[PDB]
Amino acid sequence: MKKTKIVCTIGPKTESEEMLAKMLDAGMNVMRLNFSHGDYAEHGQRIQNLRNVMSKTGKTAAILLDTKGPEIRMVAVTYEGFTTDLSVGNTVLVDDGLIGMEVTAIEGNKVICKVLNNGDLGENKGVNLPGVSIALPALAEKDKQDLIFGCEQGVDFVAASFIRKRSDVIEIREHLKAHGGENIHIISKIENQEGLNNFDEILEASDGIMVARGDLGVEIPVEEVIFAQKMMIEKCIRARKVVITATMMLDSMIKNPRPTRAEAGDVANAILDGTDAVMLSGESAKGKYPLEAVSIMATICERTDRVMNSRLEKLRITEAVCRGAVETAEKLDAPLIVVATQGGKSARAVRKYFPDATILALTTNEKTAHQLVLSKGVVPQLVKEITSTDDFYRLGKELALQSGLAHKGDVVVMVSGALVPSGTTNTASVHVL
Amino acid sequence: MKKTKIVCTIGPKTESEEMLAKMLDAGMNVMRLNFSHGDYAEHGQRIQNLRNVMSKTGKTAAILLDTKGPEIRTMKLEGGNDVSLKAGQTFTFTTDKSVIGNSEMVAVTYEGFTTDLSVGNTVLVDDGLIGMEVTAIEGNKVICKVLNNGDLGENKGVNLPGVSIALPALAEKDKQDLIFGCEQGVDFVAASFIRKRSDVIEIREHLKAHGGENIHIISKIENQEGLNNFDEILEASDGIMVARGDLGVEIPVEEVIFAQKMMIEKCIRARKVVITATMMLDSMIKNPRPTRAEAGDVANAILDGTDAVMLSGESAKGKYPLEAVSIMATICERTDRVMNSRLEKLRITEAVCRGAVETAEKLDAPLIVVATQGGKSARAVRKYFPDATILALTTNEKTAHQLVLSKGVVPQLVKEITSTDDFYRLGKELALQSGLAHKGDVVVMVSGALVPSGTTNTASVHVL
Amino acid sequence: MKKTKIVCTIGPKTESEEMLAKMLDAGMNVMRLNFSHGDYAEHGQRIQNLRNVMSKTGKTAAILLDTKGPEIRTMKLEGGNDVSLKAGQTFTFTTDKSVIGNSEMVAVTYEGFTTDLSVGNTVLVDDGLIGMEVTAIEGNKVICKVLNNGDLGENKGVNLPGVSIALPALAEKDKQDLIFGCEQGVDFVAASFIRKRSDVIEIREHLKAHGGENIHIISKIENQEGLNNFDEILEASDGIMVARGDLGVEIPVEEVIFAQKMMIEKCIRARKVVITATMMLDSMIKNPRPTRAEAGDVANAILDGTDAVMLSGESAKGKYPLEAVSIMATICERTDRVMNSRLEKLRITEAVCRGAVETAEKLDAPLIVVATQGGKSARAVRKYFPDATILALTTNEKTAHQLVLSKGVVPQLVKEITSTDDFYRLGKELALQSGLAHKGDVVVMVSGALVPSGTTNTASVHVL
Amino acid sequence: MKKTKIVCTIGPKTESEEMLAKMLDAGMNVMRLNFSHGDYAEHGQRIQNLRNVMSKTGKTAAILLDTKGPEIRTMKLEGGNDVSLKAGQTFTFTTDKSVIGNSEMVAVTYEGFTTDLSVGNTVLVDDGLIGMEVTAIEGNKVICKVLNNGDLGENKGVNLPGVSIALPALAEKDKQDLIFGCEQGVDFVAASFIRKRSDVIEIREHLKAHGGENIHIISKIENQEGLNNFDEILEASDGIMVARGDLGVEIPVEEVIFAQKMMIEKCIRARKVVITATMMLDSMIKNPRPTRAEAGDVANAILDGTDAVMLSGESAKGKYPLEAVSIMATICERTDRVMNSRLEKLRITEAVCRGAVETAEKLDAPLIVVATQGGKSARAVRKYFPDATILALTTNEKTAHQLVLSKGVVPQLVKEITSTDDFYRLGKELALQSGLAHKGDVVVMVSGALVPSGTTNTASVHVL
């Protein structure tokens, strides 16, 4: 059964309970909500329906909120500081890369440029200032209400748009914490050369990364974009942080109930690079065939996961422990690695080595039972309490057999923290069911 | 410099010497002649031109003749107008080549469309535009049921999943194209729609009848039968062309990457070339820049491990053909750059050619000089993805051109090589001459010695 | 500090408390009681002196009772006068125990001497002093030709190299000695002349009979038959004593090293103690420094991988016992200090314990703390030759004592460990208080959880 | 069968063509002439005797000159009677070679005794028989306190544990020995008591002045100074002899094995021969079979990786010199048999030669044919302990001689090789001819090509 997770952007064609239950069945794991449209009571109801389908069925799913972030769209440009922040020689581009201009003069409220290439300029096009740094907040007074709605509803993840550096992340995170959303994970969307160059620092600040290669492409040389993707997936796998692969996934399916062979290859290679999750935007949100897309997407995942291997080859404790747990599991042919988590780090720590076995992750934490839904190959499980290391062993032996994920006489490797604080994974323990 | 080779389909937009020189200058290595169109006088000239440029410049290049192969076409419609088909509708295929079609029925060029197809099977028209499962067969008719909405034009292609189409390996015309190619002396022949071992042997027997015994046969796997017979098809051929677009029509979508990755992997093991072909930078037929999706697709096939990536319409008829070769070259360069050598029943040649590459690497040699007759040893070194350029010395002119298709090899025609010490002596003179290395560079040299041409058996480390 | 354990034979010149305490200081770990000698009253006070030194000092040692064994000896000569035998002469052994021998004939204590032997067989008398070849077995006579000049004394040992001897597993006195062994509650019994599995089973039965079921049987391999059946013998035993001198008078000399190395290796694999025993520092029976060659042979046996090295008469009855222990122990520390862990069907215990050592090494842990009931999981950890010391906590005393014989384990006896977390709390307390580790140090802790005695399943890492 | 080589000391009881011939049959590879004994006529005849046997049989051997070397000895006693020294007594050595001593004073041969020694230093006399500690040095007297009881005889050896002695590199008769050594064209010279690089540089200059520039210098490491300077000594030597007995009287016991194994390790890595030399089978001087412990000591020295193992008194002045060679050789065959290649700063020869052994093993080659001018490539391929035999081809007869000492090489003097292919051609003729390999065997062939003497840069695989 598939291991990599499917994020499905849900809008009004798909928000019903009956569809949401269908889409969970087809392999949806996370509802993405893209607040570049809609009204709050609509969205608020879109959440409740999923949360109803969840009670009604026993399925887990996570909720992820998208923020739009900063934009810049003789023509008239939205951004008043355009003239300040641009510089002589700079390369402006309009309409996702279509026309490139080089800045010759800026006088007053005017950036006068020389057009470098032919193109048909229209209404409301994108302006990209590659290199150039923009003084717009990561999170402007306008998208901030989106966030607050998000904390209020208690979404699991926030994907933040147009992240260019550490500071940006920290400013999304200081917002959330101002409103009770401190336990909400931030996924940073690298959509530009600046964010790209600042990735390692964007990565230490965030909880994950959304690889938006479409957006990124506009800004950097084509022959660099896959390599950006691969690097960022690899850097995320190492850090133990979720990474979604997001843009241009199965786009044809907004018009067709079957994907291009080049889309499928492109989704399969991202999974092979090592993602946690693959994303469906309009295919599930606006298009004519949303349940078709989730289902083909799920067969691509399943077919791809199932040929992939484990990945075992200062040195840290959690790293030694969790690498041994997976090495030992596969050695002993265990179907499962059963893990105790508070905030998820150690289910994430095990997953980093791409286990054959399923991670069944026991938490008493609700947010982290949901959040873990976005981690590759992980099945979260909310438990009432784990009182001791032997209790954990005893409980997880019950839930493993009970899970149907293993049977009597199966070997199961159990991973947890014992006499340590939350941050750490420190003991591994093999058991026969 | 780029190690993977670029095969460019030359058309009349590119066939000139001044444009062919530019293409060799942007990074084209192999000229593909698509005999699904054109004529012998034209292709004859396209050949002479390249041979002229290669003479004019001193560049090397290979010439690949692509066969059109067996097809099933639907034929003509009433008044030559497209008809609109619709789901659940009965449609019917007729074997009568003079029945003109409408939205109820067409005729198909293939006389055994019934004799072969079977009640229940899938029929797809215009490269999978329209799908249809069979519900009956009677007489000269395949009575079908239409599964989705489309418009049927005239003369469309028919893809018959599963159906062992008993069409022959060589078309009526295909034989005369092959004969043209033997006469012209082309280096490779890429043969379309290879379903089994016997299909290969039928092209090889054809070429052998005509002085083509030394021509390499690149089999195009374009359907499920060919896939299922890959290992045997590969034992029989000299290389493989992965046709992704074609296979995409023929097999489930989630299988194609894996059909590609699987075929490239086995080609490398077999020491035979592999071209990754359809659906590369097709957008560049209208656009002077590629998709991010396209440049990505290309990079992943180089990373999978191809020898060569192929330009079709983008260099044959597209509006921006020199741009394709250049961005296709920068993608190559960029990708090879970050690739590693892969070193981790005995075979003497595997043994020495793996050592010689592992040593090159440890000693930081710029070059591996290899001595070949038919290219095997240079192909056997290439199998471990050396960092080092393989400079391969031949006295055989054909295998000198043929070798231009292999990854990161640079062929060089030499007068004779008289002995093992002479090889070492001559290859150092040419290694310095090549500008691929310099004084005090180490150079591993690979060759056979007191052995027949099959075998590569000795290696030698030299400081220039 | 040294990791390989020293077994010291205790006799009357070193049996005192003051001396026992010095030797414990020098490196003694195990007191061997050789029952070739002494009475039960002596060995009893011997055992008592050591127990009082352990009381008074908190040192732990073990007590290993070494049987004398069944034997074939020659018996009494005319007048008690040694005789000189000549190369080539005839000589006869007689099963007849009444015959007072001379220059032509002796009696041997073994009734089955004619049965066991064969024409062509070699008989060695007095530690291979004299050899002879069997020329005819007639009646109660074995008639031989003398292979070399030598002097026969009374009551000499006989070795039948290559021959199976149907002597019993235990001499009569041996059975009477073993019950004393049970009474006294010794930790080990080393059983002499072990030839086959059945011998070991017998011995186990005997001890089991007298409440001695927790006493470990160390099988002494002293000849070819025993070497032949070593695997099935090691299976039935708790460990092995490699008696090199005996093997050297029984099997070809060039074989004895590989006998030693094979048996230490299979003991390590089976997770069972091995003692390297005879001919260690015998020169120190007379001198206060060992030979160069003596020092090398001990060192090589530790590098082979023994748990323990043995002193015999040079700590029991020699003139420099305390110097023997000391230099023995300096060879020990010197050799241990340069050995490496050994990390490279699959079981749970082996998987866990090898992860324990491997992780310990990676994380620079001074200590691996194990909780044992019967000693196994300390021995399972010891198999990989860790750099860390193994603190092994038991509530079981006999095992706390037997674990003293195991390479580089520091046993220690505890009230109780109630749970797995209790274990990790307890072992950190004792790890710090042991002075083996200090605050900041990592400590890998190994145990069994929700499993019965047999099994080591879990492992935790902690910083002190 | 065996690969490790045997140096045998030839003395009176063994010097005859009949004897030497059986010696060679039994395992002898090198004749050691020990120049602590015997006039030049004697050694001259032994030299001739051996060269006769070789000629008359086609056998190869080498001849090695073992210098006596510089010494400190005690001198003459009153009336020439042994004096018994008592522990705690005062005892003085005098630099006055006029004095005739007794139980309180002796003269020594060494004038620098007083200089080199220090209060607190240990003096040993008669191979460690009596030890003493310096209490004061006054004038030409080193006043001591005797450490243990013993009879000092006359003309006894003195060892100064850990003291740098400024005796010269060479004794006066040593120089005259080395000149005879040159006239005789011996193949090696094992120089005695080598303690710093400058000593070797001297011995080399002496041989060079007498036309012995082709003679290899084996440095004997006999004390702590030699050991601390072993890296630069090894570097200026062609090889090493480990004098264990002497190291035993000079450095801490527990340290001697390690000194051995270190020095064997470093000679392997350096591609220079190493001989393990003293106290191997000394018991066999009086006895026809060796000791268990002696057998073990030889086997371990072989597993450490020696080229050669040395006999002394056993073959020179023993009772059973041919018994000794035989069991030594059985010990060799038996141990060599169970050892493995060692495959697992970036240089050419090391790469080619590792690859060759590496390739030979993969392909199971019985044989590696090497072409050598001064033996280096034989010694380079030997470094990895190939399973295969090295058949080493030279036109140089000295190296064909010296290569006799290298582990598992079979020297072959050939009339020429004119090219690399000429090599490959001849190496198969000889490989088949040699009975070592047979039709169908793989044979790996290693040489230099387009390179001067120093370098091994080409390897080739051939089927016979």
Structural write-up:
Chains B, C, D: It catalyses: pyruvate + ATP = phosphoenolpyruvate + ADP + H(+). Chains B, C, D: Mg(2+) binds at residues 222, 246. Chains B, C, D: Its cofactor is Mg(2+); K(+). The structure is a homotetramer. Chain A is α/β, with parallel strands linked by helices and 433 residues long. Chain A has three domains: 305-431, Pyruvate Kinase, Chain: A, domain 1 (3-Layer(aba) Sandwich), CATH 3.40.1380; 2-69 and 138-304, TIM Barrel (Alpha-Beta Barrel); 70-137, PK beta-barrel domain-like (M1 Pyruvate Kinase, Domain 3), CATH 2.40.33. Helices cover 38% and strands 20% of the residues of chain A. Chain A has 16 helices and 17 strands. Chain A has an eight-stranded parallel β-barrel with strand order 1-2-3-8-9-10-11-12, surrounded by seven helices. In chain A, strands 15-14-13-16-17 form a five-stranded mixed sheet, with helices on both faces. In chain A, helix 1 (17-25) crosses helix 2 (40-57), helix 5 packs parallel to helix 7 (199-205) and helix 7 (199-205) packs parallel to helix 9 (222-239). The longest helix of chain A has 18 residues, at 40-57. The first copy, chain A, is globular, with a radius of gyration of 23 Å. Chains in contact: A-B, A-C, B-D, C-D. The interface between C and D is medium-sized, with 32 and 31 residues.
Essential attributes:
five-stranded mixed sheet; 20% strand; 38% helix; Pyruvate Kinase, Chain: A, domain 1; 433 residues; TIM Barrel; potassium ion binding (chain A); homotetramer; alpha/beta; eight-stranded parallel β-barrel; globular; transferase (chain A); M1 Pyruvate Kinase, Domain 3; 16 helices
